[PDB]
Ligand binder design. Sequence first.
Ligand SMILES: [Hg+2]
Ligand code: NA
Length: 463
Amino acid sequence: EARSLLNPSNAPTRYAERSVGPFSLAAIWFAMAIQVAIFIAAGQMTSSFQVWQVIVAIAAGCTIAVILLFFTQSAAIRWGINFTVAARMPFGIRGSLIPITLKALLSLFWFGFQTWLGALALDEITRLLTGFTNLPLWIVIFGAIQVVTTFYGITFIRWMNVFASPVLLAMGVYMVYLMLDGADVSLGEVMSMGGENPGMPFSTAIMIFVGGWIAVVVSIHDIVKECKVDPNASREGQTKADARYATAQWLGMVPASIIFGFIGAASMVLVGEWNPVIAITEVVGGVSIPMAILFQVFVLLATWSTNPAANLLSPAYTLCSTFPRVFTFKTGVIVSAVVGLLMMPWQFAGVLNTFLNLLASALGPLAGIMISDYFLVRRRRISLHDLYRTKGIYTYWRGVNWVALAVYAVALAVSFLTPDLMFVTGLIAALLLHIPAMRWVAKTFPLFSEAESRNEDYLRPIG
Ligand SMILES: [Hg+2]
Ligand code: NA
C-alpha cells in the first residue's frame, strides 16, 4: 500500500526531548532581531516621519508580528512537527511542495546575502591586522563555519544567543554614547530630528517592519517544535501556554529592535548615513585600530545570531523531509548552504530588491490557509500517522489538493487590489475562502482519521 516518509531527523520531537523554555526563547529572539536590515529600514524611515515615530512604528510592527506568531506557532509546540511536514495538511502531501518551494527559495537567497556581510566583516578584521584582503576565500570559510555550528541544531543556537545577547546589548549602549556625546546632542533632541518630507501613510510604515519578519513567522515550526509543553494541559491551559511563549518573544524582540532601530535612525539624521560604523567615525573624528576591530566583531556577532536560525534551518528540514531516504538533517544543511552561495545573491539584491518584496508578501495566503486549516476547519484534530505516509487522509487527488492551490491563486489576485498591505490582505482572504472550499472537498475526502489514535505513540516516552 503506502510508502513511509518517516526518518529519525524528520520525526515529531518527543516531550522528553524538548529543551527551550520561555526565558531562553526570549533570549534567542533578542539576538535574532539585531541584524543589518533594521539599520537600513529605520534609517530610511526618518525621511517620512521623525525618529520618535520610527520607534513607535517599530514597537507597533513588532507587536503585530507576535499576534501572528501566537497562531502560526501553536501546532508545532503541541505536536513537535516541521514546517515542511505540517503543510501536507491543507495542500497535499505532494501539492504542498509548490508553496514550500516558493518559501525555500527566499530563505536560501537571504542565507547567501548574510553569509556575505559576515565575510566582509572577517575580511575587514584580517586586513586591519595584516593588509591581506581576500574576500571570496573568506566567504567560503564563513559559509563553512555556520554549517558546522548548525549541525548542533537548536543546542548551539540557544547557547550562542544567550551569551551573545548581553555582549550585543552593551556594545550597543556604548554605541549610542559615542554618538550623542560626540555630536553634543541630548537624547530628547534627536528624538524629533526627522520627517521633513511627509507622504507615506503610517500604516504602510508599520507594514515595512513586519515585512521583515514574514518568512520567519510563516515557518517558526522549525524552532518552536523544540519548546517545552505539558501534554496534559487543557483547551485553556494550552492557551495560556501559547500566550506565555508569544509574550516571551515580545519581551525579546521589542527592546532589542527599538534600541538598534534608534541607532540606524540617529545615524541618518545626525550625519546622513544609516550605517553606524561610518556615522560614529565622522562624529568622533577617526578611531583607533582596536575600537575599529570592535565594530567589526559586532557585525559578525550580529550575523551569526540571525543567519543560521532564520535562513538555514528551514531548507535543511525541507530536504531531509521530502527525500527522506536520500538526505538527513546534517546532510540537508550542507546542500542548502551550498545552493545558497551558488546563487551568488549579493549581486542581485540591488536589482531584485522589488521582486523579493513581492515574493515575501505572497506568503500571506500561505500563512492564512495554514492557520485556518488547523484552527477552524480541523479543530486542532490532526493525524500524525497520515502526515508521514504517502496514501492516507492527506493524499487527496494523487498527492495534491487542487481546491487549496485554487484558494491560493484567487487570494493572491484579490491581494493586488491593496498594494501597500499586500501580505495582510492575502492572509485574510486565504483564511476566509479556505473554509467553504474545505467543506466542499470534504464531501469527497475525509477530514479525520482512525489512525489519529496513535498520535501519542509518536511523542510519549518509549520503554
Ligand atoms: Hg520588529
Ligand atoms: Na543577530
